[PDB]
Symmetry: D2
Subunit: 330 residues, 4 copies
């Protein structure tokens, strides 16, 4: 049993919590956000996207009792005041989206935690890991990042394609679901003007470093990929549209065979494969971080192809956050 403490009970914090209930090796013993225990119990119980929590949630004496287990609840705005050691926290899932550098996240280690896993791309040199891409390179570091949802989708796919055919260069577009940082109606978003426009009314272009980041987890692809994003009016589930130029010519059939083989072997549980007429909602709740859509992709010729891969930006990522926690715990 690895004892985890969650900082930031948001979309990711809550989905990591629900995913943890199905794992015997990991156990959440404390949660911090800036909310009351009864309000947190409410956000755990009901979810517009994923449905009602299956289990019991009761608030007793300012703490949560979920399925019998007692969970310490705090509302400390500063991580240094979390006292993770009081509850015996081994690893902390840093999910606020505010402490993405070694110095801010290190506060949890000062507070008594042993290791920290950021649930977003680090903003400094903190190493990023993506399952299926470079977990094996982990060298015992105490602060680590699980990268972004888009990088978790792109990397495993990019790896299989490169290994078999060699990527000369590629450009990616992610059609992404609306997130907590957007607005309901045209509002202020000083650092992202487009991002402040009404989410339900618009297709909103957005820049993203998720493609370039693949170079950090798969060094051999460094400098060969980049891309952008379009935010669209759906509440969850996104898709990667990767246009790549191949070194070795490969028919679309050969590409499908390579992906399927990896989906069934080395990357089972990370990379998925499908030939069904799927749409985004079909992946709501999906745990695989990259699901190759065989019928959506199209090849101009044997060396220039467009590949499509689905990912539940909330669920797949959250499950891999747990995987990384177990991994770094040996």
């Amino acid at each position: 049993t690895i004892k985890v403490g969650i900082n930031g009970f948001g979309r990711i914090g809550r989905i990591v919590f629900r995913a943890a209930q199905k794992r015997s090796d990991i156990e959440i013993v404390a949660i911090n956000d800036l909310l009351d225990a009864d309000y947190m119990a409410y956000m755990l119980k009901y979810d517009s996207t994923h449905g009602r929590f299956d289990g019991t949630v009761e608030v007793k004496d300012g703490h949560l009792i979920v399925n019998g287990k007692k969970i310490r609840v705090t509302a400390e705005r500063d991580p240094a005041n979390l006292k993770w050691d009081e509850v015996g926290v081994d690893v902390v899932a840093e999910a606020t989206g505010l402490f993405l550098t070694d110095e801010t996240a290190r506060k949890h280690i000062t507070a008594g935690a042993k290791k920290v896993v950021m649930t977003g791309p680090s903003k400094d040199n903190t190493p990023m890991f993506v399952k299926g891409a470079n977990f094996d390179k982990y060298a015992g570091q105490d602060i680590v990042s699980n990268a972004s949802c888009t990088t978790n989708c792109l990397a495993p796919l990019a790896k299989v394609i490169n290994d078999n055919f060699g990527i000369i260069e590629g450009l990616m577009t992610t059609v992404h679901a609306t997130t907590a940082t957007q607005k309901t109606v045209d509002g202020p978003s000083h650092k992202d003007w487009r991002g402040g426009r009404g989410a339900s009314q618009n297709i909103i272009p957005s820049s993203t470093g998720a493609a370039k980041a693949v170079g950090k987890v798969l060094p051999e692809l460094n400098g060969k990929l980049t891309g952008m994003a379009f935010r669209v009016p759906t509440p969850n589930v996104s898709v990667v549209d990767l246009t790549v130029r191949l070194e070795k010519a490969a028919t679309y059939e050969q590409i499908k065979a390579a992906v399927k083989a990896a989906a069934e072997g080395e990357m089972k549980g990370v990379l998925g494969y499908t030939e069904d007429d799927v749409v985004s909602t079909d992946f709501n709740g999906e745990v695989c971080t990259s699901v190759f859509d065989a019928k959506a992709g199209i090849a101009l010729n044997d060396n220039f192809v467009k590949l499509v891969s689905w990912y539940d930006n909330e669920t797949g990522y959250s499950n891999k956050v747990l995987d990384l926690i177990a991994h770094i715990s040996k």
Copy 2:
């Protein structure tokens, strides 16, 4: 020319600004928010709901030049530091949604303004006015409130019905468009748990004092009305569903005749009337604050009827804010 200064360039501040361009008696000479002049120019220029601004917008030396006219731009968080007198501001349209009491709004008068019009229901005893209901009671007060969008819809209708048939009692439901206070995905809303749930995914019940407030503008209806609201996934335009018990029996035809007559006489420009098969988008940009939908209403009997009335929560209200400004300016 009445010189107006806008505090809070939000949905209401921006729509009041655009409506003012079509009025010769009123002129905006200054705007305050917590944004840069170039960002404000951007929010003025493009609107997801109402389209591009028709006119020229240029940012010169930290100020706006709209259709030739220079408009002072400030970003003072505290109203007491606005120096409205420097630009000769007569009336201020208080549109931040934060200064709804005499003492907070009075800061604008300290800052050099002569009168203040709140664009929301006052939270204290500041008098509320609704065009078609009680503008004639205005007695020279310096701080005034234009009430809420729902009250502006309900009051003129309630008045005509009461005058002709006498309201014994009534309960109102407003199916309302999503607003800036809601969330894109399930998030924190400590003072309104339902209001924090994903806006595009849900029908969200909400309490509202808009019905009871009709009693403040039409004292004779005090204690006879109340209601609630359902927030739905549309970006603009709302509708009042009023269930009333009548003193004098009246056929639905008689009710239509009374409303139409008022729409064409005493309440022209405030109360509208229609017999078309309309839907919400048909009122996007509507200036009348209450548009009676003759075909949507239904009568159980001559003394118990359900009446339906549309209102563009942004445009109708903004236009009446301007009307009140002119009214109080004599």
Copy 3:
């Protein structure tokens, strides 16, 4: 087990099929629609609203094999040519929405079925039964109707209120989710002009006979209720807003006490009760046909109140279709 055959594998037909899987007493043995087995398998497997089918579905020799059981598949456009004889069908869930009269629905009896349950309100005098309102009135009829989803929500609530406090008169509004009947963009809808307007962009007023239909399942309420609907931009789950005038004075606390009592007693499984800050998505998958929202309702006085009740228009109703099938087969 009762062998059931489904005619019309649409939204209701499909949800009835899923619900039946969780019942030991009912068993679906044949399905009819105008689609190939492969397409039917795909529609069962994937659902945008309810998620992926919980089980295995294969196609073998033009027939479905769901969870190992063979299910005869057909494409007869005429009920008479269905041969329910062969497959041993006892009751038919008539879900096409085309045969809502004895004349047409009786073709299933001709075709070998013993009884028929229409999944919509009968257009002739075929008796309608609503669980919680009049199942006890069933008198051996071979063709019955399960009324509509809205009536299934309103009846159980209206009975509890009437029985305890006496409903003098009431007017209802249902804020309803979008249905297959609507258009994605402004299109032709000859029968109902408002209904052809873009579903996602509008609040669309609509007529409904659901309130009057209550008078047929609860005669004591005949002529005392009527209402209308507002179709809004959500994919599933609706809510009734009932404004009633009470004979016996009752405080909101007493109304709550009565409803809660019925929910835990005589109407267990039909009428639910909640005091949480729920929103529409919290009922997606809900089995009870009427879930009373304690906190959403509001009373003007002891004899005039607004009551709010939720219902998953697809799931609750479908489970009740199965309940009626069990009932008329006792």
Copy 4:
């Protein structure tokens, strides 16, 4: 003036009608569809996407009177029985989407019309013309096609890029608004299974021949482009995402310079250029068929870039249908 007759008063037929009102050279004198004059008047008057018709529309003796001009109204399901002779129709805007071949469309010539413009891509070899790409190639043909909305967006852009830097190969994706073809809720769509899934709930992968179709209006690009689409939850306005490999090295600044030059010169009115932080709604009502988004695009290197261009799939295209009508009538 050119007297035009419209066949198919759908989205395109209606928007072509509105656009024609703003043109002195074209004049609509007759409309045909399978709807009554009253219903047609209602559909013209109210539009969920484009607002209320700017003018007067009356029905008199089963015919429309728009802005004082009489417009013959008909309901012939067969083109041959249209008698365009009587009304003096020169060109027919064939917008039903049913007659996309010479064989079928020629019935209008039989019926008295001089020429025909199909508002969709021809299914046979009827030549296609795209303003900005090959209008200059028109050689007197009496039946021509205006291609599709997507091709109208892609062609002008592809020509400017190819002419200046040489396109070796390209792969495109169009993130497209919802169309009348889609379903509001999971429904039957035999031809395209993904297309029957709930439009509002999903990102739906789709095929498109628009990229290949570029090869027919710009032969030099035949076999060098192909692509796909993603249908998303918005009512109007789409965007092409073009990933191309350049023969001649060009920096993004040089690509911008070339596009801006074409927008202000040879392609004025067809191809637009912008550097603002625009989103989809900013193009609702846009006349240019391809608006280059300078800031959204991204280059990996001097020979591999992603270009982004916006288009109001209804308005731009409709204005171009009028341009082609003017062109083939010179």
